């Protein structure tokens with residue numbers, strides 16, 4: 001499918 | 014005609030047909046009022062004879078392989094309240110004649126191969142409620158103005174299309190619209206202010222476009238607003254303080270834009286906020302104390318910004334906080350002890366900031382914390398012994414600070430700890446043998462510290478993939494115990510006081526791709542066994558030691574070696590044993606006692622001449638023709 005709504009994927013060091 | 018899947022009208026003729034998940038294939042009663050052929054694996058075109066049932070209020074063709082255009086005569090059925098063509102391969106433009114269906118309520122075109130623009134005729138559909146056409150990569154053009162004429166609209170989404178331009182001011186007119194999803198599209202321009210005129214709007218998903226201008230203040234007048242996802246656009250300007258007037262709003266993502274200004278103090282008023290994501294913007298100011306009134310907050314991501322000040326101590330007021338990322342800001346003061354009262358914290362990243370003082374011990378009292386990333390700050394003090402109290406710690410990075418003293422032996426209490434980086438600090442004393450009790454430890458970087466004493470093979474967990482002890486005071490000899498880390502891959506001991514022979518048991522480390530022994534006191538002959546890890550691929554640096562003798566013969570077996578540096582040693586003899594290594598990329602033989610001829614291959618003519626000059630007898634030869 002087209003993907004369900006999402007937040008920006010979180011980034012850490 | 015009583016068959017299962019058939020419904021007869023009260024006048025006796027066929028009314029409804031229903032079929033689902035019957036695993037059919039191929040292509041595919043003038044009173045039939047509803048037709049559902051769905052999950053049937055059908056192919057080919059929609060037969061143009063679909064218009065032959067003039068009584069249809071519902072056509073559900075969804076979830077097949079059906080192909081070709083949408084027969085225009087499918088739009089000759091004016092009793093149709095529902096059209097689901099979705100999850101198929103249908104291509105073609107959306108026919109203008111679609112406007113001729115006065116009674117269409119729900120329209121689902123999504124996940125197809127469709128293309129073209131959206132006809133300006135959708136405005137003729139006055140009872141349309143759900144329009145979902147997204148997941149068509151070539152559906153394009155501006156969103157028609159006439160869309161504002163669908164008065165009963167509830168759901169609009171065009172997500173994952175090529176749709177472009179600006180959302181028209183027309184959107185001021187949909188007063189019942191709950192969800193607008195246009196995300197991962199070609200949209201540009203500013204969000205129109207008139208979107209503040211949709212009273213019923215709940216979710217706005219515009220993320221992953223290039224949207225310019227600033228977030229309109231009028232979004233604050235949306236009393237029913239819940240989710241705002243604006244991430245990855247060009248959005249400029251200050252975050253509107255009026256967003257504090259949106260009581261039901263539990264989710265805000267502005268991540269990856271150009272925003273400037275302060276995190277609004279009105280945010281304190283937001284009782285339902287679970288997640289606040291501002292990452293990658295130009296936002297400045299201190300973190301406002303009122304944000305700690307946010308009781309239901311789970312994720313606060315404020316990282317990659319200009320925020321200044323101290324972490325608010327009232328941060329203890331958020332008891333549901335799981336993830337807290339402030340990295341890449343300018344933050345001063347202590348990491349407040351009271352942060353450990355958030356008992357649900359899984360992850361903290363405070364990296365790349367100015368934080369000072371010690372790391373409060375209470376943080377290691379966190380029972381669910383798998384990630385503590387404090388790297389690159391001004392941190393001082395000891396690493397607390399309470400570090401063993403932290404049961405679930407997985408990824409620990411303290412690197413790039415001033416932390417002093419020895420590494421507490423309690424760190425061997427941590428049975429889940431995969432990754433620790435304490436490099437670039439002031440640490441002292443020996444590496445505590447208790448670390449041998451970290452069952453899970455695969456990555457250990459201690460480089461650039463004041464560490465001293467003698468290494469030991471019994472001090473290291475056998476599961477280690479990666480070890481960097483470089484740039485320390487470590488002395489005595491490399492232990493034979495080294496032969497017991499069989500999963501080891503990179504090993505860097507460079508810039509220490511280590512001495513003695515290289516133990517021959519290194520050959521039993523079967524996984525080793527990198528060995529850096531550079532800059533130490535090692536002596537004796539490079540052992541025959543060093544050529545015995547066929548695995549050595551990335552690098553071998555023996556440079557800056559006291560090694561003597563000739564480059565060992567088994568070296569020709571390092572067929573995967575791409576970099577070898579033997580420079581600054583007492584080595585003698587020729588290099589002939591190195592002349593068959595075809596994958597050899599970089600070779601530094603300089604400052605040694607080598608002599609004899611090297612072939613005229615393009616490799617050796619690349620070696621600097623001063624390189625050959627620092628030796629005894631090195632020169633390039635010419636083969637006898």
Ligand SMILES: *[C@@H]1O[C@H](CO)[C@@H](O[C@@H]2O[C@H](CO)[C@@H](O)[C@H](O)[C@H]2NC(C)=O)[C@H](O)[C@H]1NC(C)=O
Pocket residue numbers: 374375376377378399402
């Ligand atoms: C880590 O674990 C230790 C051991 O359970 C905790 O502390 C002791 O702390 C209690 C309560 O503060 C005292 O009554 C004892 O005197 C301490 N015992 C010893 C031998 O030190 C400690 O508080 C925990 N640390 C954290 C930050 O959670």
Ligand SMILES: *[C@@H]1O[C@H](CO)[C@@H](O)[C@H](O)[C@H]1NC(C)=O
Pocket residue numbers: 507508531532554555556557576577578
């Ligand atoms: C090998 O070690 C020395 C001393 O640490 C270092 O300066 C040199 O760069 C290393 N060789 C390579 C391939 O970089």
Ligand SMILES: *[C@@H]1O[C@H](CO)[C@@H](O)[C@H](O)[C@H]1NC(C)=O
Pocket residue numbers: 556557578580581599600601
């Ligand atoms: C030897 O050569 C390599 C590659 O040119 C270089 O990076 C390295 O610094 C040199 N070794 C030393 C000890 O200077």
